[PDB]
Structure 1
Amino acid sequence: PPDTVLEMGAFLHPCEGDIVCRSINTKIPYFNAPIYLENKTQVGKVDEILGPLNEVFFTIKCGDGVQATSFKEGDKFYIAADKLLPIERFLPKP
């Protein structure tokens, strides 16, 4: 279990059994990083990172026993703080 969690994403679309989330946090998660709820309960792993720089979205691949239709709008998804990367890392070097 993670020691601390941070507000990663907000529920947007349940499409194709995966959770689409607006990235509330300002840093980019690891690929296949575990996504938790605030009681530190693992809901799934990060599957895809997409969207422009101003509005980053990410798609969580749900774990087994979790269904995408069960969530509602405004839900929050949490990640351990070790699984983050700065946005300037992916930007081209000067």
Structure 2
Amino acid sequence: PPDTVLEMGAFLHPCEGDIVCRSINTKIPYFNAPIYLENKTQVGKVDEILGPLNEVFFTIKCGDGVQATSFKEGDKFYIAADKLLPIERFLPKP
């Protein structure tokens, strides 16, 4: 596991076995980027990035033994620093 992980998302609700998170990070995650806790333990990987620019959500593909119903609202999910890329890339260039 990486030494430095940054808080990425906050729990919103489960959806079809996946975890929906409102992004509490300014940057956009890499596809299939692993999702951690404060204990540096992986709960899953980023499955889908969705939502408007002001309010970004992402759904996590839960791993083996990780259940979406086990988590409660207000739980924070963490991502590695190198797995974030700036939002200016997806916007069209001037």
User: Shift of the alpha carbon at 1:3?
Assistant: 1.2
SS in 1 for 2:91: coil
SS in 1 for 2:69: helix
**Identity fraction in percent:** 100
Deviation digits for residues 24-80 of structure 1, max 9, x if unmatched? 000000000000001100000000000000000000000011100000000000000
Cα distance in 2 between the residues matched to 1:14 and 1:28? 21
SS in 1 for 2:65: coil
TM-score (norm 2): 0.99
Question: Runs of 4+ in structure 1 displaced over 2 angstroms?
Answer: none
Q: Which runs of 5+ in 2 are unaligned?
A: none
TM-score (norm 1): 0.99
Tell me the matched-pair count. 94
SS in 1 for 2:16: helix
Q: CA-atom RMSD, angstroms?
A: 0.4
Q: Which runs of 5+ in 1 are unaligned?
A: none
